[PDB]
Scaffold this active site. Structure first.
Site, short mmCIF file in Angstrom:
data_model
loop_
_atom_site.label_atom_id
_atom_site.label_comp_id
_atom_site.label_asym_id
_atom_site.label_seq_id
_atom_site.Cartn_x
_atom_site.Cartn_y
_atom_site.Cartn_z
CG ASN A 173 22.45 14.96 34.50
OD1 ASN A 173 22.97 15.72 33.87
ND2 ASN A 173 21.79 15.31 35.64
CG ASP B 120 22.05 19.90 34.59
OD1 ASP B 120 21.67 20.03 33.14
OD2 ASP B 120 21.72 18.98 35.24
CB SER C 105 23.76 15.67 28.82
OG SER C 105 22.34 14.72 29.44
CD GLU D 287 17.51 25.30 36.83
OE1 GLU D 287 18.50 25.61 36.00
OE2 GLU D 287 16.31 25.61 36.68
CG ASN E 133 23.01 19.16 28.32
OD1 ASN E 133 24.29 18.70 28.22
ND2 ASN E 133 22.14 18.28 27.88
CG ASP F 294 21.57 12.38 31.13
OD1 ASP F 294 22.69 12.65 31.22
OD2 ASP F 294 20.55 13.24 31.47
#
EC number: 3.2.1.17
Length: 129
Positions: free
Chosen positions: A46, A52, A50, A35, A59, A48
Site C-alpha cells: 500500500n 499484506d 505497510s 483478501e 502486515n 501507507d
C-alpha cells in the site's frame, strides 16, 4: 500456492475461527477469499508503507517480524515465513489475536467491501466441515 474454498475452511474450523470471540468461519473465508484469493503467498503493498503478506494479510510492518522492513513492531511476534509455507496456523494465530483485539472482520477491507452485504453462511454451504 493458493488454498481452496473448503480446504481452507476445514482448516479454519480446526483453528477455532468458527464463531471465535470475533466471528464465524464464514466471515474468515469471505474476508480471506477476497483478501488474497486464498493466496498464502499473496502480498499487497500500500501507499501507507505497510504490506499484506498473508491469506489474511499479515502486515509484517505491524505484526510479524520479517526483517525486510525496518520499524517492525512485532506486536503479534509471529514467524512470517512460517505462515507462508502452506500453513495458515501462523497467519491465523495473529488474526485470532487481531479479532480478539477488537477488529471483528472489520480490520480487513476485503470483507468490508465485497463481503459486507452478502451471505458467508452460503460461502461454505456444501463444504466439508
Amino acid at each position: 500456492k493458493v488454498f481452496g474454498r473448503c480446504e481452507l475452511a476445514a482448516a479454519m474450523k480446526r483453528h477455532g475461527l468458527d464463531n471465535y470471540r470475533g466471528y464465524s468461519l464464514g466471515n474468515w473465508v469471505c474476508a480471506a477469499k477476497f483478501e488474497s484469493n486464498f493466496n498464502t503467498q499473496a502480498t499487497n503493498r500500500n501507499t501507507d508503507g505497510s504490506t499484506d503478506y498473508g491469506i489474511l494479510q499479515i502486515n509484517s510492518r505491524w505484526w510479524c517480524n520479517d526483517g525486510r522492513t525496518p520499524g517492525s513492531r512485532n506486536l503479534c511476534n509471529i514467524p512470517c515465513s512460517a505462515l507462508l509455507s502452506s500453513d495458515i496456523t501462523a497467519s491465523v494465530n495473529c488474526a485470532k489475536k487481531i479479532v480478539s483485539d477488537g477488529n471483528g472482520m472489520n480490520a480487513w477491507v476485503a470483507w468490508r467491501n465485497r463481503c459486507k452485504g452478502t451471505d458467508v453462511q452460503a460461502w461454505i454451504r456444501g463444504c466439508r466441515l
